[model samples]
Target: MVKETKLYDLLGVSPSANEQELKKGYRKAALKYHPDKPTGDTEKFKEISEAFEILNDPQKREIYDQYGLEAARSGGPSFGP
Candidate 1:
């Protein structure tokens, strides 16, 4: 079976990381892979953006944590107030 990569892993942060940590990780990765940077990789930069999109949202992060990426993509359980 093909192993799936988790969002936290993609951002180089721990599963328990807080918002600040997430932002820091994303910033570091973004700087490294920026279009003008020597080590820049457009594909990797896009991947980073996708990871941040999910993780930066509380509801999305909750769904991703409980049901994984597949469910998050499928619109997992509602987290209504």
Candidate 2:
């Protein structure tokens, strides 16, 4: 598992998942949480985006592995809470 599982959990993927699978997971979650739909949630959509934003980039992913979700968000200009 990762140092922090929130991102993985939010995206509904295992920490050991491959990049291709990670993209699929993000697409799935993004659609589910997308604010335009009946089932949408703005807050969760934002969180999902935050999760994907960090996990999709190797550099940021490495930092998240070493630190945690919070560290990952702070590592860049954020729209996170």
Candidate 3:
């Protein structure tokens, strides 16, 4: 697992954020970092997408909160196959 602290930091969000905050954060970050956006960086965009894929789902977010990054990849929610 990557650790909850690192995961949260990667998304530039605090652990205390509510669902609305999480959604807002994801929306803002996606807009700023989406690969197709003119201002986006491909790698950073991907990372942001990856973060959203996990945090957007309640189950995945719970797993991530408990077990960090690896669980989010192996047993938790993921974007890519």
* Every model: Cα RMSD to truth: 6.2, 1.6, 3.2
Model 3 clash number:
0
Clashes of each: 0, 0, 0
Q: Candidate 2 on 15-41: residue-level lDDT in tens?
A: 877799889999999889788988899
Candidate 2 — which pairs collide? Answer: none
Q: Model 1, range 1-71, lDDT digits (tens) per residue?
A: 11244788879998888899999999998998888999999888887887888899998888778777777
Best by TM-score: 2
In model 3, where do residues sit more than 4 Å from their true spots?
Answer: 1-3, 75-81
Q: Which candidate do you rate higher for TM-score, 2 or 3?
A: 2
Per-prediction TM-score:
0.78, 0.88, 0.74
**Which candidate number would show the highest lDDT if scored against the true structure?**
2
Instruction: Give the lDDT ranking, best first.
Output: 2, 1, 3
Q: Which lDDT values do the candidates have, in the order given?
A: 0.80, 0.84, 0.72
Q: Which residues of candidate 1, in runs, are more than 4 Å off?
A: 1-5, 75-81
- State the TM-score for model 3: 0.74
